[PDB]
């Protein structure tokens, strides 16, 4: 009958979303608004919201239901629609000039295993608002949850009158189909949301490519910060979706003056402090791999789970695992994506800033600071040059939750569009009405 | 004090990298002083006219008095640091700021079409955004490009700028372009040229902006002002000898006004060719062995072209006109010459459809002349070009006779449009949670 | 071509107590978050967009005022509830450089006194309250006596919803007996920081002579110009739909046609084709003018907002419900041209050229600088009359209500300020601009 | 050629009436040329200096060196035609443009405090908007305003402007100010002065912009850079001898750092009066029987104010500093003298609430020196002034040391804020139904 959006071949998946895009060029702005709203109701439906949130966890073995229940709702509510497509206007003696945001064509989107449903909802809303179709390439670990969402969207858009196959994917998401999608001529723009290997891959294809890379965000806490509030926002921001967010705090850098009071307020807020060098080393055997990287089995796991594996039984109060280590520690250097939070002590905030730049590894992604000194907040904000910089709040404030602005799950650091929206999936066009319609 | 011109490619890259790391420690007023310095170098009449002849002399393309306007339009209507605006959103959750920060060192590739205009354009926009620019000019514009880079480097040193903000190579060539592409220390690539260099910077694993080519059609219908349309068409097509990426390249005339349009094209300096044999002869000259325009004719005047087929002509003639079918290579192949075929159609509604077809999905430039709002709306929306000019010459889309700012790096494939300082900057967010909400 | 182309309830017995209660409401509103404002604005929206009260509020205004029709007011009440800007209208400007960061913000005014008309009684209460409360203000309403009960009723459902949402009491207040005296009482109260007048030229003249900041949304007399290049078929349909909209009550609705002579006759045919009753007999035209005009040359109160079928019945002409307006071709000095009848009566004046049309439309506008419409296809003539007539709203090739967001691009409003320069008023129009300079800090670029 | 100055108010208005009609036929480039002409007038060095001595000498208020900075600030950072932005939104129902269009003839009433800065600032804003301006300046600054207007007409005459775009009366007074406000052909009033003239223009049945007065307090808290705070408060309070409506007029310092603040304020040229006998001598000198400021002392230097009480000191002194209770008249009155009282409070929240109290709900200007981003936000969000400067001099709220544009007409009651060209324009909406939606 109607297409379910899922095809057996990447080539005809691209050819199907290529025909959809052209048909989609006949649909009015109001059609886009109904389609965009149709995608919101699909995920914000309470039966679907709870279903995608827990099933993703069931299939990926990462994150938790309660938090992807919030993240999925953030992608549905705070993702911009067709209002994002603004129009610049310049009226003068030479008439008028309009600048619009117009469809690219067909977009290929490569989505991660840390925000499988969130990224698809966030991409599809923006890419369809800008008048594009999208060919998705999900991470094969999130294959089942992603295609089902792809299918749920196709059904809703069919009931609204949309052209078939505005959102599509493949039945067997693989590394080969992802490469196949990057090579297909009809694909006009690529959007990559993942690690450094995939971001550099879409940049080598001869096509327009949005690159959302990895992070390693430090959170500086100087003597000026509200230590009680700082330690609360840290635990919440680090335990959020079990540290899967690319913004989630992954190492603490505190000045010696307030460090012991920070650790005390951190434990008070649900941190389990590891002080014995043996159980710490015992923890490194659990969560690390060969080549000193993170184990995907431990990635996205809870603090209850990780301490269960080293013979420590704690209740549900424990949200993170705390330890004060040197800066060379692998938990500091690596993007653990786990509620494991090291803490490096430094003499002054200037040393905390100069170190936070180093452990950023030039990712230019996310950095957090707790401090009420404007001069010190703007010195770190200027020097580290990250795409998102949160101040006196949990890191998820930079995604629109607890912070001002809209929400996105594709954050462009390398290619540099920042928090991508519908403007990011559109071509910039200029229209010059010479010596007419200067009605000032 | 360095001159901004280095012996090898790795030397210029490593010096711009040290420059931008030092450029970061500057203020916005320093950026504004260096921006004005770049404007001063080209807008100086002594240098302006030197840059306009050397480009015509060395490359052998265009004329000097039109490059006089193109070089001026670049240093005059290019956005400066005022292009870097700030977005703010305040409420219960605090204050959000969105800024345009530096990328780092930018590698820039320029065409033989507009050597100096593109250097002036990229320098202002990239340096205003806090970047440094490593230019890799075409070998056929080498000596004028190196002269302009040194004049800028000289000027900026007298303003207190860190050295090597604008750098280039002593021996520009194809392989120096490829060494700038592979250099890990280049953060952004901007390419203003053919379709092969654009896909090459798009295949290097780097952030790349590609300003592609086109084939701009101009549609005329029974509703247009025919006298002003034929003046705007000849002026646009013959601007800098049809070198600009925006200049008209073929006409599509509604049959109802096609004859009266051909008369007013003549009255405004168009030389029509009616004998099919003399129209063979120019196909022999400008089109070469296997169907592509010949680089020796590209950028030459209409008088120079008519002389090569033995037609001595006064400087009144600005273009070579001919009524011709839609399959003739003069309509399909981007000539970049003051040769302007015309295709006659019955209707305006597939005058539009024919224009979309001959544009060849470049979605670059299209022009239309008329009085009906719905018809200008219909063609401007369906053809989906980056620039669409209504009731004026093509260069009106460059800030010359139209509203908006000026650019010589118009990104088609990569979607930035008329690139400016913002186009060469990283969008960064800054969230002050639960503070600075002063409403 | 001759063818064209193809807990308090909110209501107080005295005016002063309404202001004193609205001032106390301002004190407490300043302690409420933007989310509270958003929930209170969203509260008002549910008040009018709830289908039962939506039908309910529409029949009232027709029953109490005798003006307009029910189905079109069902459209105007929904248009105010949906397309009026909320707290998203309060945007922020930011400037960042070497000297730090400067923000400019829209901040509340305090207590606002709003004077509403009888032609749009509930639409203006919805629209004023949304933007005024979104900007962080409290509003005192002085309704027109003719639409007393429908206005009093809406303000009570508003005070009930907001209370149920935890809003400070008396955020939106009014008087128990609206009167011109209670209007002058509001104009003179020192606690009222701003005035907003939506009515005739006399009420706008008053608010600007009180010693307070005032937004004056005055009257209109919009002409509609059709030249030989217009889509005459579409022109006639838009003109009849726009003129008859809510029985010509809107300040935007068409009031007189200025048609180029070449297409004027074909235009009339397509006006009749779309439900215009053409009056040719000199005598029966006198009957309507004797019925519609008063001794002072102004419109008849008992006839304002009455249907075209109702007006034709009173002169002894029975017609079916397909007739929406009344059409007569008359000279330019005819009263129906010079007066804002606010009735489905449409005069047409024929002119030689489009140049003459643009000039007479300027002459007929009466310097209201409010609304003007022109159906035309040439960009140069559209540009000429738009730039020249200088109206607050200018509509091209559409119905007049496209300047309200109905079939046009933008937000809706029912307070359209011309002589005071605010344009189509929204939350920004009801707020003060504040500049916050952070010297040599927060420049993070 | 007319010089713009007329014998009667009615003759000036009618001249500005017909001039504004003729103005409506001019282009944006024409407006741009006239605006730049008014910039060149005041920014000319000899004219910049001339205006500044002539004002001080004719009014007896302010100092030369600071009115040099301020007159430069009005011609250099006042918005031009770039201030008149266009809004636009397109979709299915077509295109909608929003534009800023001129009112008509505007009447502007300038004050003695800044006679030249307001004429330069007003005239640039209202001509940029396409309006004409009839000026009714203060009689105390009578000949400096007519010479400034005359010099302006000569410049506009040379540029090709319609005669009498900026006009004034030969004999300024308040009698013809009323004539201006009661003239049918004036369309907006712009009153820049005290609370009387503001309510006067708002009672005329006409659109009016009223820029009232204020009593700006500056709050210092324990987080403030005391060496930098004490420096900025002296530069800001003694700026033009406290004449600017923005200039600090009383300090509210927390007890923790109040003595070290006064310690560092004297390093910057403060004179502490500790003997109530000497202090009362100032009181009887500068206040009035009913406690108002004395016109003879307004704008007088601190050196001169101390000479009227015998105390002789050099020009190193810039202000007269006194620690004093809150109810004292120096705190409560907009003195516009370099007299700066200090009110010590215990906590920053006492300072915040007190600065709210002494501001008298003028909601005009307030300053705060502090490093805590929470306290800066708390006072800004509560005092609700149209200018709020943080960690800098008062005049940083007028583009001199801060971000943004400058103005000299600050609308507090009427709510326009820092009036620019946009303030003197009507918003018009232009709806193209079902056309020009080319997205
Ligand atoms: N900046 C952002 O917006 C953002 C958002 C979510 C996740 N991430 C990052 O993703 C990373 C972890 O998620 P992940 O496990 O899905 O990483 P991942 O790179 O393994 O997977 C991302 C996607 O890219 C594909 N991919 C990866 N390598 C590829 C290759 N060599 N060739 C072709 N395709 C390839 C994968 O199939 C997958 O679909 C983290 O580093 C996180 O920072 C970034
Ligand atoms: N969109 C714009 O802003 C713009 C402006 C001017 C010209 N153009 C286009 O550029 C073309 C004319 O300029 P051009 O002849 O110099 O184009 P081009 O193909 O030569 O590209 C310009 C640069 O690319 C380099 N280059 C080209 N091929 C290369 C290769 N195989 N390997 C390494 N480097 C290579 C050249 O060294 C040259 O410096 C036209 O197509 C015109 O439409 C576009
Ligand atoms: N510009 C706009 O946005 C807009 C919108 C709707 C209606 N209007 C105009 O309103 C008028 C129709 O409404 P109306 O019948 O209520 O007219 P109206 O002028 O009599 O109504 C003005 C309101 O203020 C009261 N009022 C009238 N004159 C007053 C006076 N001299 N002093 C004090 N109060 C006075 C009235 O009781 C009424 O409540 C039309 O002229 C229409 O153009 C304008
Ligand atoms: N808000 C601002 O932007 C701003 C700017 C400069 C000065 N001011 C204020 O102005 C005052 C200092 O200047 P000033 O001495 O000229 O003030 P002022 O009130 O004495 O005079 C202002 C102008 O308005 C006229 N005027 C005053 N009262 C009038 C009345 N009742 N009727 C008719 N005309 C009247 C005066 O003739 C004069 O031209 C201070 O209070 C200062 O705060 C405010």
Author numbering:
A (entry chain A): 85 to 524
B (entry chain C), D (entry chain B): 86 to 524
C (entry chain D): 44 to 49, 86 to 524
Sentences from the paper on this structure:
When AldDH was crystallized at pH 4.8 with propionyl-CoA, we obtained crystals with triclinic P 1 symmetry, diffracting to a resolution of 2.5 Å. We used the same condition to co-crystallize AldDH with NAD+. These crystals had monoclinic P21 symmetry, diffracted to a resolution of 2.3 Å and exhibited twinning (twin fraction of 37%). Electron density in the active sites allowed the fitting of NAD+. Interestingly, both co-substrates, NAD+ and (propionyl-)CoA, occupy a similar position in the two structures but with their adenine rings pointing in opposite directions. This was also reported for crystal structures of the AldDH homolog from C. phytofermentans, and is consistent with a proposed bi-uni-uni-uni ping pong mechanism, in which the aldehyde would bind to the active site together with NAD+. Subsequently NADH is released from the active site before CoA can bind and the final product, acyl-CoA, is released again. A conserved glutamate (Glu419) forms hydrogen bonds to the nicotinamide ribose, which appears to facilitate the correct positioning of NAD+ for the hydride transfer.
Here we systematically reconstruct a part of the metabolism of the GRM3 of Rhodopseudomonas palustris BisB18 by functionally and structurally characterizing three core enzymes, and by reconstituting the reaction sequence in vitro. Furthermore, we show that the acylating aldehyde dehydrogenase (AldDH), encoded within the GRM gene cluster, preferentially uses propionaldehyde as substrate. In summary, characterization of the GRM3 AldDH leads to a revised and detailed reaction mechanism for the ubiquitous (present in all three domains of life) family of acylating aldehyde dehydrogenases. These enzymes take part in numerous pathways including fermentations, detoxifications, other catabolic and central carbon metabolic processes.
